[PDB]
Structure formats: C-alpha cells, structure tokens
A paper describes a structure:
In this work, we show that unencumbered views of the changed, non-ground state can be obtained by recasting the problem as a multi-data set, 3D background-correction problem, which allows the relevant signal to be extracted from conventional single-data set density. Our new method—Pan-Dataset Density Analysis (PanDDA)—comprises: the characterization of a set of related crystallographic data sets of the same crystal form; the identification of (binding) events; and the subtraction of ground state density to reveal clear density for events. We demonstrate the power of the method by applying it to the most demanding type of changed-state study, namely crystallographic fragment screening, which attempts to observe in electron density the rare and often low occupancy binding events that occur when a relatively large (200–1,000) library of weak-binding ‘fragment' compounds (150–300 Da, 100 μM–10 mM)1819 are added individually or as cocktails to a series of equivalent crystals. Applied to a series of fragment screens, PanDDA yielded markedly more hits than manual inspection of density, far more quickly and all with high confidence, in both known binding sites and new allosteric sites.
Z-scores are assembled into spatial Z-maps, and clusters of large Z-scores are an objective and statistically meaningful measure for potentially interesting crystallographic signal—events—such as a binding ligand. Equally importantly, Z-maps also make it possible to identify weak changed states (for example, low-occupancy ligands) that do not yield strong difference (mFo–DFc) density. The BDC is determined algorithmically and objectively, and results in event map density approximating only the changed configuration of the site, including protein backbone and side-chain conformations induced by the change. As ligands—but especially fragments—invariably bind at sub-unitary occupancy, we generate an atomic ensemble model that reflects the crystal content implied by the density correction: the changed state modelled from event maps is combined with the ground-state model, with initial occupancy of the changed state set to 2*(1-BDC) (discussed in Supplementary Methods). Incorporation of the ground state into the model enforces our Bayesian prior knowledge of the crystal, that the ligand is most likely not bound to all copies of the protein in the crystal, and a superposition of the two states is thus the most likely situation. These ensemble models are indeed well-behaved in refinement, provided the ground state can be easily represented by an atomic model. We adopt established requirements: a strong correlation between the model and the observed density (real-space correlation coefficient, RSCC>0.7) and that ligand B-factors must be comparable to those of surrounding residues.
Author numbering: 11 to 341
The structure:
Amino acid sequence: AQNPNCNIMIFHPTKEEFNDFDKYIAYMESQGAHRAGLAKIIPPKEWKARETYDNISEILIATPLQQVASGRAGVFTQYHKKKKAMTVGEYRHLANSKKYQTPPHQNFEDLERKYWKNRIYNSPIYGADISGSLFDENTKQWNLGHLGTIQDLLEKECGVVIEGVNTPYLYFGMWKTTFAWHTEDMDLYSINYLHLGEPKTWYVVPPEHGQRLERLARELFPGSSRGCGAFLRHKVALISPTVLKENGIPFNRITQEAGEFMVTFPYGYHAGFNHGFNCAEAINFATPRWIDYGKMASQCSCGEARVTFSMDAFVRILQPERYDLWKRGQD
Ligand SMILES: O=C(O)CNC(=O)C(=O)O
Ligand SMILES: [Mg+2]
Ligand code: NI
Ligand SMILES: [Zn+2]
C-alpha cells in the first residue's frame, strides 16, 4: 500500500503533466496522496494563474465576516458576525492596520504558536465564499473556473442527468482568520489556489481516521453534539494540534504559500488559519472514486448547515433514504 503512514505529499508536475487535470489527480492517488486527506501541488515554473494582481482592489466583499470565538485557547467555536460591505482595497488596508496585522515573529512555527495561544482573544474579519474567479480566461491548465462539473461527473458515472452548477469562490483573509474543522459538502474533493499574499496553514486528519476526530469532537463539544448528529457540518469548531496530540488523533500539518495548490480528498477533515492578508480561490470537484464517499456522507438535518442549491440533487440521487429528512432541514 502506498503512503501507509498517511503523510501529506508534495507534487511538482512538469508543464506536460499539468495539461490533464483528471489524469494528474489519478496519478497522485496512485502514489497514495489521498491517504493524507490533503496534498500540495507546486505548478511548473512556466505556469501562471494570471498576469498581475495589480487591479483587484475594486472587487466587493459584500458581507465581511467577523469571526468571534468562544471557549478555551485550544478548544473553541467561532460564530460569524456580518459586517458592512467593503472593497478588497479597503479590506487589505484593514488587514494591515495595527489592530489586525500579523505580529512580529521568527518563522512559521513561531507564528503557529502565537496563533493557538492568542486566537480566541481577537476577532479577525474574513471575506469568505465570494462567487468569482481570478484565473485569466486564457489560462488553460488548472484553471479552477474551467473544471469538469460534479453534475457531469455524476452523469458520466451513474447515467443520471441532474440540475445544478458549481463555480469557484474567492476568500480574502487576514491574520488569524480561521477555517473550522470540516470535510466538504457530500465529502467532495476541494482544490484551493493561493493567489496572493501571506501563507495559509492547514491541519488534516487522514480519511481512514476521520471518525476518531468525530468522536473527540463529540466529547469536546457535548451540547453541539446533542443538537446535531453531524455538527461539524456547521463549520464552527476548532481543536488545536496540542489537543489532538493529547487525545491521540492522527493528523498532519503543512503551510501553503502564494502560487501553490492544495487538494483535499474525500472525507479528509481539515482546518487552518491565514498568516496575514491573502487571497485564495477554491472549488469542489469529483472523480469516479468520490461516488462511494458521496453515498456514505453524513448530513446535517438540524437546519444549521444550510448549503448550496446543487447539493439537493446529490442527496436525492446518492442518498434517497435520507433525502426527505435532509430537505426538511433545508426548509
Ligand atoms: O481557505 C479557506 O478558508 C477554507 N478552504 C477550504 O476549506 C478548502 O479549500 O477546502
Ligand atoms: Mg478590481
Ligand atoms: Ni474545505
Ligand atoms: Zn446540524
């Protein structure tokens, strides 16, 4: 078996290998990359996402989110308080202000220590889930707005045509902005490109050990667990690497820098934080290997999760027994 320790693998495709997206994902899996839950892909030196990022300041962040924490330094939840709209130029200025800027630090490890020590005492503002793309339309390789759709994948594999669309989302981050422990909707893959700015640190649990993380989360967030059998779908819970280690949860960590792709694999729980002002683009995707994960994916039906239009068809076709209950949660 390839990659039996479930390490995060890093790939350096050639420009020739970068032509066929599906083929390269399959190649990574042939080397055991999926066992980690997360892989890094460094594009060939000849590739670029777009010419320059000099003209992005007029993008609107319609609903910036202030991420307010509750709990203890290593075990906390966050809720999202809506703020007034601001442009990316305004957001960048805010990120760099004394109140929100990255503190002096020695290296990534020092900054990581500061993050887990101090995160809960601040409330950074995130521009998340903004529909759009920063890939040049002429970028032919690994253009996250030109991927084969999940709906077409499901049709190719299972023969059923379904409604729905999926398009990329932009994320504008600042120091301490946080993504909570989660797997993707329907345990899909995701791919994330860091366009510009400061790094993003990721934590990930191997898919084969995801239920260990779930069990710990139930113990650490007991009220939330009683409220919903899939409350990590709410994407609000954080658990530090120290607490994971104390509880014997297998995980890995890696820092993504500007110009690098990360792929998360089906049922790979992940969480992380931004180092400073940055912009990432991400989208969900599927492969034939995803279908069995989609069939088995947990669902939130308590009403909190509330997801995209396109998830309806996924649940309807892959999980018909769960569909009625899930849809009640939607409404
Ligand atoms: O970048 C973020 O804030 C969150 N991204 C993801 O969870 C992802 O790409 O799957
Ligand atoms: Mg602009
Ligand atoms: Ni994700
Ligand atoms: Zn729920």
